[PDB]
Design an enzyme around this catalytic site. Structure first.
Site, PDB file in Angstrom:
ATOM      1  N   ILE A   1       0.833  -1.169   0.000  1.00  0.00           N
ATOM      2  CA  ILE A   1       0.000   0.000   0.000  1.00  0.00           C
ATOM      3  C   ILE A   1       0.879   1.234   0.000  1.00  0.00           C
ATOM      4  O   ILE A   1       0.527   2.268  -0.586  1.00  0.00           O
ATOM      5  CB  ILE A   1      -0.873   0.041   1.256  1.00  0.00           C
ATOM      6  CG1 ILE A   1      -1.881  -1.084   1.213  1.00  0.00           C
ATOM      7  CG2 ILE A   1      -1.618   1.383   1.400  1.00  0.00           C
ATOM      8  CD1 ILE A   1      -2.812  -1.037   2.369  1.00  0.00           C
ATOM      9  N   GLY A   2       2.004   1.132   0.694  1.00  0.00           N
ATOM     10  CA  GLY A   2       2.947   2.225   0.748  1.00  0.00           C
ATOM     11  C   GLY A   2       4.087   1.928   1.683  1.00  0.00           C
ATOM     12  O   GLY A   2       4.076   0.907   2.367  1.00  0.00           O
TER      13      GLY A   2
ATOM     14  N   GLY B   1       7.527   4.280   4.013  1.00  0.00           N
ATOM     15  CA  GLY B   1       8.199   5.528   4.406  1.00  0.00           C
ATOM     16  C   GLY B   1       9.062   5.323   5.641  1.00  0.00           C
ATOM     17  O   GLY B   1       9.638   4.245   5.825  1.00  0.00           O
TER      18      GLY B   1
ATOM     19  N   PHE C   1       8.041   5.036   8.559  1.00  0.00           N
ATOM     20  CA  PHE C   1       7.274   4.007   9.259  1.00  0.00           C
ATOM     21  C   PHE C   1       7.628   2.560   8.918  1.00  0.00           C
ATOM     22  O   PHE C   1       7.241   1.673   9.653  1.00  0.00           O
ATOM     23  CB  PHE C   1       5.778   4.231   9.029  1.00  0.00           C
ATOM     24  CG  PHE C   1       5.370   4.240   7.586  1.00  0.00           C
ATOM     25  CD1 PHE C   1       4.869   3.094   6.991  1.00  0.00           C
ATOM     26  CD2 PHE C   1       5.457   5.413   6.818  1.00  0.00           C
ATOM     27  CE1 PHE C   1       4.461   3.100   5.637  1.00  0.00           C
ATOM     28  CE2 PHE C   1       5.070   5.438   5.452  1.00  0.00           C
ATOM     29  CZ  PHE C   1       4.566   4.282   4.865  1.00  0.00           C
ATOM     30  N   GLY C   2       8.355   2.313   7.829  1.00  0.00           N
ATOM     31  CA  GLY C   2       8.620   0.950   7.360  1.00  0.00           C
ATOM     32  C   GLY C   2       7.795   0.677   6.107  1.00  0.00           C
ATOM     33  O   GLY C   2       7.839   1.458   5.181  1.00  0.00           O
TER      34      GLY C   2
ATOM     35  N   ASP D   1       0.473  13.099  15.924  1.00  0.00           N
ATOM     36  CA  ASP D   1       0.635  13.154  14.458  1.00  0.00           C
ATOM     37  C   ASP D   1      -0.751  13.049  13.792  1.00  0.00           C
ATOM     38  O   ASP D   1      -1.008  12.175  12.924  1.00  0.00           O
ATOM     39  CB  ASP D   1       1.619  12.049  14.014  1.00  0.00           C
ATOM     40  CG  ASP D   1       2.157  12.214  12.559  1.00  0.00           C
ATOM     41  OD1 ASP D   1       2.170  13.338  11.979  1.00  0.00           O
ATOM     42  OD2 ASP D   1       2.583  11.166  12.004  1.00  0.00           O
TER      43      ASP D   1
END
Length: 346
Positions: free
Chosen positions: A28-29, A31, A33-34, A146
């Site tokens: 899905i994506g 960054g 975050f992993g 966040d």
């Protein structure tokens, strides 16, 4: 084609691992975050998300520990977690989460690219659901740190909103200090911009108040790529903060600033904007952190009366989702509001 099978502990409940099995694994994506995947549970055929981060030798994972204590319908639920092995001879945590197909960011952008603005009903539904999720996590003393449109997942058909990403979340305790580099660009509260480390959960609220203005305006209310810029956009709207206000935010700074008068909130929004929408903003986006509404006090704000109308439906003919199933925990901040938050007909 491919069926991965693992032995995973469940998010909540007793520590009794089971055989989970899934297939159709898509990114899905990814960054800081992993990496986040989508996949399909072989049993139910039900979709899920998998967040994969590298696991510290030294310490137990903070996000994990928080996610296990949380259960609330406006917050992605940790279904399972497990340990596995892109970097070899090393250990990855995997959180298996609820899947939710859209984000407010994308929807907001869709309306913007089309030179239109989200119908106020959808603003009302979404913000209200976000304000509950804060109400809940704040009652544990946990701050998310966040809040921004991307971390607001949506199901467009059911109008359910779920907060996500607890990678920055932490429990604030009075007298412990906290790093001031944690919010994202357009949504940081002034106390953070000024680098204060005695901040409270009221940061999460200032952010929501930015998300609201963003949805009503069709573009970010306090943009800028530097602190300075963000601060000038803020002062343009709130006017020059006073001495007493600066001390309340950050004592060490009490710079001088440009002497600017406040452009009344009514002159900030598009003309056919509802005054309760504006009314709410002004009480969310306050210099003094203790002057900002609490999330529960927000849910009970006038702007949200239409949601408590017994005839409210979604534009697509379906019923509104759970709005009223409060628990004792959610309400602990201020229980008398139940009389307003839970309407006669629920």
């Amino acid at each position: 084609s491919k069926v991965t099978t693992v032995v995973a502990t469940p998010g909540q409940g007793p520590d009794r691992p089971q055989e989970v099995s899934y297939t159709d694994t898509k990114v899905i994506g990814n960054g800081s975050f992993g990496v986040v995947y989508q996949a399909k549970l072989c049993d139910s055929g039900e979709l899920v998300a998998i967040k994969k981060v590298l696991q510290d030798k030294r310490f137990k994972n903070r996000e994990l520990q928080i996610m296990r204590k949380l259960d609330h319908c406006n917050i992605v639920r940790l279904r399972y977690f497990f340990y596995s092995s892109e970097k070899k001879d090393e250990v990855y945590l995997n959180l298996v989460l609820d899947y939710v197909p859209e984000t407010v960011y994308r929807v907001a952008r869709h309306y913007s690219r089309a030179k239109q603005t989200l119908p106020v009903i959808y603003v009302k539904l979404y913000m209200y659901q976000l304000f509950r999720s804060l109400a809940y996590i704040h009652s544990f003393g946990i701050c998310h740190r966040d809040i921004k449109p991307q971390n607001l997942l949506l199901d467009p058909d059911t109008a359910v909103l779920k907060l996500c990403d607890f990678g920055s979340a932490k429990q604030l305790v009075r007298g412990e200090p906290n790093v001031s580099y944690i919010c994202s660009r357009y949504y940081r509260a002034p106390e953070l911009i000024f680098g204060a480390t005695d901040y409270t959960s009221s940061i999460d609220v200032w952010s929501a108040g930015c998300v609201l203005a963003e949805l009503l305006l069709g573009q970010p209310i306090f943009p800028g790529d530097s602190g300075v810029d963000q601060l000038v956009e803020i002062i343009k709207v709130l006017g020059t903060p006073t001495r007493e206000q600066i001390r309340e935010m950050n004592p060490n700074y009490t710079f001088k600033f440009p002497q600017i008068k406040a452009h009344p909130w009514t002159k900030v929004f598009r003309p056919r904007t509802p005054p309760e929408a504006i009314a709410l903003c002004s009480r969310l986006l306050e210099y003094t952190p203790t002057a900002r509404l609490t999330p529960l006090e927000a849910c009970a704000h006038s702007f949200f009366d239409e949601l408590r109308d017994p005839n409210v439906k979604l534009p697509n003919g379906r019923d509104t989702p759970a709005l009223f199933n409060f628990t004792t925990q959610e309400l602990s901040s201020n229980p008398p509001l139940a009389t307003i938050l839970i309407p006669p007909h629920a």
